[PDB]
């Protein structure tokens, strides 16, 4: 259940070949407040698709 040879750092790099993170593609921009947010999420100030959906 354990190895018999030390796997190389080359094999280590090939296993980590798929472990890269995917950056967010494009931030949607609100039409009223003009700030950037995740697509289909509310903004930090509380806007979503123009209207002020939550006070603060």
């Amino acid at each position: 259940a354990v190895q018999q040879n030390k796997p190389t750092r080359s094999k280590r790099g090939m296993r980590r070949s798929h472990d890269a993170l995917t950056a967010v593609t494009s931030l949607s921009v609100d039409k009223t407040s003009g700030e950037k947010h995740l697509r289909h999420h509310i903004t930090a100030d509380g806007y979503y698709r123009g209207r002020k959906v939550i006070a603060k």
């Binding site: 995740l38 289909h40 999420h41 509310i42 979503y48 959906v53 939550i54």
Partner: protein
């Protein structure tokens, strides 16, 4: 396999889910907007919105049913005196999910679930 089934297990047993949605449906009627996780917010629509539809017909029996679902007379009073006539013309869809990002403690995808006629 999970063919054609419904209802989220939410890593809880059946009595905990029923008691959590009993607390959470009362908390949504009380404050008209709450912030919970996105799977719990989507599953809460199947609890609160049958209670509001129950509240459109103010009978003594329906007060007893809504009390049997919620077990809080303050919620049952708010359902039939306020949210009953507030949603009396809407054909369902009494609430709204607003995804609000990610919780800092555990990266849980959160969401605001609110009533429609709040603001």
């Amino acid at each position: 396999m999970r063919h054609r089934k419904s209802g989220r297990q939410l890593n809880r047993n059946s009595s905990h889910r029923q008691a959590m949605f009993r607390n959470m449906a009362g908390s949504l009627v009380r404050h008209e907007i709450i912030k919970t996780t996105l799977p719990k917010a989507k599953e809460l629509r199947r609890v609160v919105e049958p209670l509001i539809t129950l509240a459109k017909t103010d009978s003594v029996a329906n007060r007893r049913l809504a009390f049997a679902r919620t077990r809080d007379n303050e919620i049952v009073a708010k359902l039939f005196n306020e949210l009953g006539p507030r949603f009396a013309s809407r054909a369902g869809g009494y609430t709204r999910i607003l995804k609000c990002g990610f919780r800092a403690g555990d990266n849980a995808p959160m969401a605001y679930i609110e009533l429609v006629d709040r603001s």
